[PDB]
Amino acid sequence: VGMSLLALISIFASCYMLVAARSKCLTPYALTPGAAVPWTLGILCCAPRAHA
């Protein structure tokens, strides 16, 4: 039980870190009326799939 709990905590922490990194790297582009840089779009998937 302890091992499973530790593994779940670690994987959730890592997933949260990935999500936070994506959101923080992608946020400045939603504060401009500009483009999304398809090069970064492909690697960093975002909610707007085709719009803007």
Added chain:
Amino acid sequence: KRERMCMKIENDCIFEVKHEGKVTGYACLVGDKVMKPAHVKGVIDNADLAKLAFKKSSKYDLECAQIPVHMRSDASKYTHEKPEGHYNWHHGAVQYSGGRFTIPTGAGKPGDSGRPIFDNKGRVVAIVLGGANEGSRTALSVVTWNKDMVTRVTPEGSEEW
């Protein structure tokens, strides 16, 4: 002429924000995005803009959202070019020298955050956040645009209006 068109654009593109029945800040319609400073708290005095989802970012102190389709024609026009000279503002004229927005009069008051700084051709250049009292002049803590980046300029001693 310039003042009249500036007021006409402002009346159709600026909305007050009410908190506890009092004004706290202004939300402006620039391009296709509703813009409002993050530190200002309250609700926008508009039913349509009230239910929109805002993407917040404390680093730039700004909340943005996508405008509804039926209000897309009542928004101002933007620019990213900031040459040296003078620019218009609702409380007079602002001087841009060496990357600094300075208010000669020091007429800024708390609750005036979010008022756009206008260009000569009626375009929006930047959005004010607060002012820094440097002698008889008030340096502006302002948020502006690069070609595709948002950059926040904060002179020393600035306080959030």
Added chain:
Amino acid sequence: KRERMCMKIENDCIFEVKHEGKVTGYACLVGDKVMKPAHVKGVIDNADLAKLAFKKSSKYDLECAQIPVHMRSDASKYTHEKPEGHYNWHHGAVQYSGGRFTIPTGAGKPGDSGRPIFDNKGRVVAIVLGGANEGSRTALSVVTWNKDMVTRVTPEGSEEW
């Protein structure tokens, strides 16, 4: 002056398409290819063009075919430059602002799809597909030409005419 040869080229480069006997769209001759947008259905009111093989592409909502040899002298002229300003149209003048084609009147109605948008010198710039009601204005969803590629611009909320 401009409206005269504008509608004259429109007379020489627009053929109606009728489905169940009622007009539904217009097909125009640009360069060396007949263009009719894919969403509208019907038959071209001409024996020669109705017999041609039209290449299908639902991604660009455009149907193209190569014009016959003896209609080559009755075709308009094309270009790939889109400077900011005003351009001509069958129902008036269109406004180009920030990468958008907008109708000042908002009088666009279903059945007007495929009507070309002209330049000042009579060259063709884009083809009208549909519009989106931006309150007092309507943003045009059109298909244009890059230097060597076809691109489609569709504002949100647009409906196909």
